[PDB]
């Protein structure tokens, strides 16, 4: 009947709109990877610009929420920008009301609670987006916390989201099982970027050019995104490795 249309329970105890939003999260057909370094945090995403009439500088799914928090979105760009604006407003309001910058996990929990409110109320529809917040929290160090359209959120040593998410996840798992540590033992953030790009090339099995990647880096008290030429330099360094 109509238990498939709004956020009410099916006889099996499931919410079909949540599942369909989850399915919609992959509409962009882009894979994103996130890893923690020794003192930084890197996020890589596929930049796919099909139309040449497009301004390639405007195509991005990574957002600078605050001076410290970055957020990469898997899902349509309307809901992506909606979540981005809401998260920026929440971070600013938190900074104003409580006197310090909003933590990564706190913003993630706030967005997950909002998604849960969408999960229980009828007039609000879920947002077909998966949100990965990354930062270097002053109390927790490198932090990666991810939320989904179900209101669920959790933190990772390293994570991946997208159509081929299982492959990248298994790759990272194997690497960490071999290293027996929960981070990329490297002092420079450029090397962690190179590690992430290398392992994404290994998992997805495709070569990238400078215009095929978005690279966000979060260091203590800063979150930025690399330009095309910095990504090209990282790809050159990767190609010159063994």
């Amino acid at each position: 009947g109509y238990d498939r249309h709004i956020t009410i329970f099916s006889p099996e105890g499931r919410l079909y709109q949540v599942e369909y939003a989850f399915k919609a999260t992959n509409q962009t057909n882009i894979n994103s990877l996130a890893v923690r370094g020794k003192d930084c945090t890197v996020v890589i995403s596929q930049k796919k610009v099909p139309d040449k009439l497009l301004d390639p500088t405007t195509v991005s799914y990574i957002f600078c929420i605050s001076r410290t928090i970055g957020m990469v979105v898997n899902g349509p760009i309307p809901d992506a920008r909606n979540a981005a604006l809401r998260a920026k407003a929440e971070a600013a309001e938190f900074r104003y009301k409580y006197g310090y910058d909003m933590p990564c996990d706190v913003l993630a929990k706030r967005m997950a609670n909002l998604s849960q409110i969408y999960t229980q109320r009828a007039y609000m529809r879920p947002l077909g987006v998966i949100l990965t917040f990354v930062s270097v929290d002053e109390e927790l160090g490198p932090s990666i916390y991810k939320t989904d359209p179900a209101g669920y959120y959790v933190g990772y040593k390293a994570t991946a989201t997208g159509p081929k998410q299982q492959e990248i996840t298994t790759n990272l798992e194997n690497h960490f099982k071999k290293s027996k540590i929960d981070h990329i033992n490297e002092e420079s953030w450029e090397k962690v970027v190179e590690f992430a790009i290398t392992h994404m090339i290994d998992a997805l099995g495709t070569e990238f050019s400078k215009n095929d990647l978005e690279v966000g880096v979060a260091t203590k008290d800063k979150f930025f995104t690399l330009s095309a030429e910095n990504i090209e330099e990282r790809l050159v360094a990767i190609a010159e490795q063994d």
Partner: protein, 249 residues
Amino acid sequence: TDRYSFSLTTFSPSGKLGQIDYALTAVKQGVTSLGIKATNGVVIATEKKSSSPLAMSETLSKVSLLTPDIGAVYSGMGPDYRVLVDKSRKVAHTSYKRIYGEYPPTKLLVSEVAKIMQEATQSGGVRPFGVSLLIAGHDEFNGFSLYQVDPSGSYFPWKATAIGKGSVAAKTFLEKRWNDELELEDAIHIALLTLKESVEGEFNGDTIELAIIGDENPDLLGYTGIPTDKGPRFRKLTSQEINDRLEAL
């Protein structure tokens, strides 16, 4: 515009509230959690089923603190439980502590959470909560108490029980194993035994969460100088303690 002002949970001709039963169904598919009341404390326990080993299971807590003497665990939908714990903390602070200067007793806090959930089952444009809650608390005039709250908004006091997938098999195990003279460590051991059945993967301090409402811990108060202020009764066990007690199973 929220035009959904009508009830989404109505009575069927068979005298059934469909959404309530469907929430109970969603609860039954949740991971098993359990609670056991002893003579000098209560114990709540559940399995920390992570999605991927890349995920840090400690960052997500199934056992949460409501008041320094009242904790809670759940079975069902994680996000509903999280927002319910937030609402419960806020209602315990506002609707009691800001009025009487003391934290609410277990029965009244459970009643408030039950009111919230019933409003979720009767108000307009909303579905019932897809969780079942086991709340273990301690107050001075009622002692220790363990309550269960269902999506229907009803709550019951249990000497010991469990909810989730392997609830029945767990509950039977508790009936043959429980008595009215158990000490706190006995309840902890029985909880670990009952949980070991309803778990499929590894069974260690990093895959299980367990909290106790036992003695007052003044070392966890953070300040000294007030003799009338003793430590909290709620304490989550560390993975080291869980594994130490597993080593003697």
